[PDB]
Amino acid sequence: MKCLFYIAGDVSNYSIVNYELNGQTQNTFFAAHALYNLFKPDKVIALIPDSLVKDNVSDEECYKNLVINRAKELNFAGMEEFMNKVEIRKIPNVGIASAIQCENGAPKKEKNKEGREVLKRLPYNEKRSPIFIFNAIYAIFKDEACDEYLVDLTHGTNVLVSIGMNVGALFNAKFYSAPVMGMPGKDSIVNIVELTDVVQATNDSLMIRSSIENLDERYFKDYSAKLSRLNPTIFEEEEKKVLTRVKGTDVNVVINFLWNIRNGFTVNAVKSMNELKNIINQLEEDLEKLKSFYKNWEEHKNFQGETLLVLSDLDSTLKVKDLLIEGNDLEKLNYLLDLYIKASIYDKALSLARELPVAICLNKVGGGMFDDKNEKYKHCNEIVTSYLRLRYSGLMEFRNTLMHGGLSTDMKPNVDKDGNITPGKIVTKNKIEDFVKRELRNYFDKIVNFLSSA
Amino acid sequence: MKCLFYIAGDVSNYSIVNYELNGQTQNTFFAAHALYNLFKPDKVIALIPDSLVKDNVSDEECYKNLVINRAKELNFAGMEEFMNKVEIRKIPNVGIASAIQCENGAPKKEKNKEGREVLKRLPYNEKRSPIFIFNAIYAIFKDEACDEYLVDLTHGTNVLVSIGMNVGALFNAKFYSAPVMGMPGKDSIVNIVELTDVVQATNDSLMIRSSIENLDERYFKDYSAKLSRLNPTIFEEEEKKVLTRVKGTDVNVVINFLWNIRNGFTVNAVKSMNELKNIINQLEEDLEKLKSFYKNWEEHKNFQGETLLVLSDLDSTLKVKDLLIEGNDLEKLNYLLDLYIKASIYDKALSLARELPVAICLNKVGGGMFDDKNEKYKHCNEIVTSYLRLRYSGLMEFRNTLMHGGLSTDMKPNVDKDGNITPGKIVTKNKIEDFVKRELRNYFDKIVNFLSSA
C-alpha cells in the first residue's frame, strides 16, 4: 500500500498552476494533489509544523479548513473528497517564524491598517534540536505501517526539508519537490523534480567507500547497468569521446578483486592489482575530464537532463587505488597482509602471515610449487612451522582457532545429552584484536628477517 | 584547511539581526558571515546559483557587488576580511525563477508605479535533472581540496538545499541552517541549527541495518557513548523511567554477537542468542514508549533540546531480531548456518556445515567434548569425515580451500626465482557462490538425515 507524505508550508499565498512529470500534468493549485492524482496513494499524511497554525481547539481541523478556504477563494474543482482521506500530523519546528492564529475551527481575520490580513504578529520563537524534529517525524513515518513511501518536500523550511529527507531515506522513499521560486500567477506550468536518485547516489558512494575500507564486495553497488543504458539523445564529439570511455569501465574487475580479498584468494587478487592499476588510471583521466566538464557546466548543457551519469559513483570507485601497490607478487601479498590488518579481518591476516614466509623462503631457493611433493616447499614449510612453533607459538594457536571456529577441537566445546553446548575456551576478543593489530606485523617482519639469511 | 560552503540566495531582503551558537554571538544579516567569524575558515565558497543573478561579462562579481551594496546601505562595520577574500562558483538550478539582472557590478534599479527595487527577469525555462545539479556541486566540492568541510544550507531552494546536503554528506561536512520563515525584523536574536547529527543518524542507521544483513559488526555504529552521556535536566518521572531503561540497553552484546558470528565463534554466538532475545524484547517496549512520546511530542518538550537520543539508532538495532531463533544450541547453530549462506560468508558456512553434523552425532550418543581424547567424538568425526569423503566429496574440498586460501597446499600456486606467483587449481567466484548458495544446504540436510539413524 502506497503512502504520500507532504510538508504543509502555507496555502494562503500560492495559486493555480500546471504541475507536470513524465509528460503528464494535473489541473491543481497545491503540489500534494498533483502527485496524489498521478500516483493514487492509499494514505495521505499532512505535516503541520507547531509554528504555522494554532487553533487551541484542533490545529488538525484548522489546516483542514485553511485549505478548503483557499479552494473557495479561487473556486476550485474537487479538493473536498481529497480532504476527507488526508490524515493530518503535527510536526515540530525551530527558529523565529510567521505563526498564524486560529479562533475555533477557522483562521481569524485582522483588518490591520490598509489591506486584509490574518493573525501573524511576532507569533513564534523556539530553540529545538533538529534530532528532536527528526525523531518526531521518524515516529510518524514508522507508525503509518506503509509499504511504499512517497515524500513531497515542495513546502517547508530548508531545515524541515533536509530533516524530512533523512527520515524518508530510512523508509526507501521516492522524494519529490516543485521548485516554486516566487509565483507565476495563472497559466504557468511547473515541473516536479524527483530527488530519489540524488539520495541513492550518496548512499551508494558511502557504501562503495566502505567496500574498499573493509575489503568487502557485498557493500559495492554495481552501477554497471546504470552505465550500460546511459546514452543521451544529444552529444558533442568531446563528450561522446569521454562517455564511451566511462560507459566501458570494468567495474566487475573491482568487484572481483574485493571478492578474492574477502574470501582469501590472495594469489589471484595479487595478480589482478596490475589490471586494476590500469582500470583506475583510465578512470582517473575519465573523471578529471568529467570534472572540468561539470566545473564548466554552462558550456556543456547536454548532460542538463541526463540522470544515469553520476560522478560520486565513479569518484568513490577511485578509492580502490588505496588497495593497490607496485612490485613482485610477493611484495604485493606483503601489502595485502597489512590491508587485512587495517580492516579487522583477523583470520585471513593470520593465514597470510603464516604462509607468506614459506613463499618468501621458496623464492630464495629458486622457486617451487606449494605442494608436499615439492622438496623445496617440504623443507621451507618445516623451517617456517618449526621456527614458528619455537618462537611465535601464539601466532599458530590463533590462526588455528580462527580457521576452525568455535565448533572445533581447537575450542573443545562440550555437547550434552539434551542438545546444549558449553564452550571449553574463552573467546579472547581483545587478545585477537590486540595480537593482530599490534604484535603480528612485528612478528612477521622478525620471521622474514630470519629467513633472509637462509 | 577549513572551507565554509554556502548558498548566497538573495541578500537584498536580509535584515541586520544577531546570531548565536555554542555561547558565541556574531551579528550579520546572512548566516554565512556569522559562521565565518566564529569558525575562521581558510577558504569561503559562495556557490552562486545560475537563476538569481544574470550579468553579461562575468556575473560572479555581480553578486560580489550585490553583497557589498547591501553592506554599505545599513553601514556595516565588518565585511573587510570576508569580501575580496571570498571565492564564488556558478551552480545550476531547476524549475521557474529568474531575478536580478546586472551591468558591470551593482544591480539595475526600476521605478514602475511606486518604489525603487531591482527589476527581476520573469521567464525561466530550465528543465534539468537534479543529478546534473548534484554532479556540478560535487565537482566544486571535490576540487576545493579541503580537509574540513562546513556547509551553510540556510539559504537556497528546498531542491538545492537537499542536493547540497547529499553532496556535503560525501565530504564529512558539518551542516548549518538559520531558520527564518517570514520577516524577523532588524536586531533579532536568531540561533543557527546544526544538521550534522541528523545526517549522521541516517548513515549510522543504514550501516547498522547492513551490519545485521551481512553479519559484520564492523558496520555497527556503537551509540553506547551517545547513550551514556544522555542526561537531560528537567524530565518527568515517566520520561526518567523510560530514559533510564534505554540508557542501559546492552548494545555491546549486539556488537559482540556480530563479532562472534563474523569471526566464526559459532558456539558463543548461539549461546548469547537468548540474552539478546531479552535485550531486544526490552528495547521493543522502550522504543514503543519512546514512539508514543515523540508522537505526542508537545507533552515531552524536555527532549526538544536533547541531541544524544536518536530513535533511528535504536529502531535499526531491533533488526538484530532477524538473527535470532529459539531452541537447543544445535537448532540455533542450524539457523546460523543458513544466515552464513544468506550473507555471502562462504568460509564460515562450510566449516559450520562440516562440524555441525559431528555435534549432532555427539548429541545422539549422549554427549561429549570436541577433543581427540573423547571416544564418542573420535568416531563421530570419522563417520562424518568418511560419509562426506564418500558421498559429498565437493563440500570437504571447498571447505579446505577457503580455510587455507589461495597461497597454500590446497591451491598449489607456484613461486618463481623472480618472485612472480601463478595460481594453480584456480577456483571461480561462481563455483563457490553457486555451490554454497544453491547445493550446500540440501547436502547438509542429507548428511543430518543420515546421522539421525546413528
Author numbering:
A (entry chain A), B (entry chain B): 1 to 454
Provide excerpts from the study.
SisCsx1, as other members of the Csm6/Csx1 family, is composed of an N-terminal CRISPR-Cas-associated Rossmann Fold (CARF) domain connected to an α-helical higher eukaryotes and prokaryotes nucleotide-binding (HEPN) domain by a helix-turn-helix (HTH) domain. The SisCsx1 monomers are curled around the two-fold axis to form a dimer, and three of these dimers oligomerize through their HEPN domains into an equilateral trimer, thus assembling into a hexamer. Each dimer contains a cOA4 binding site at the vertex of the triangular assembly, and a catalytic pocket located 70 Å away inside the triangular oligomer along the two-fold dimer axis. We show that cOA4 binding activates a cooperative sequential catalytic response in a hexameric SisCsx1 complex and that the RNase activity is switched-off by Ring nucleases, which cleave cOA423.
A cryoEM map of the complex at medium resolution was used as a model to solve the phase problem by molecular replacement in an apo SisCsx1 crystal belonging to the P21 space group. The Cα backbone built in this map was later combined with an iodine derivative of a better diffracting crystal of SisCsx1 in the space group I212121 to determine the structure of the apo SisCsx1 to 2.9 Å. The cOA4 binding cleft is formed by the loops connecting several secondary structure elements of the CARF domains, including residues in loops spanning residues 6–18, 28–30, 47–54, 92–100, 153–158 and 178–188. The conformational changes upon cOA4 binding induce a reshaping of the loops, so that the oval cleft observed in the apo structure shifts to form a cruciform pocket, in which the cOA4 is bound. The active center cleft comprises R354, D372, R389, R399, N400, M403, H404, T409, and D410 residues. The SisCsx1 dimeric arrangement results in a symmetric placement of these amino acids, creating a diagonal electropositive stripe flanked by two electronegative regions on each side.
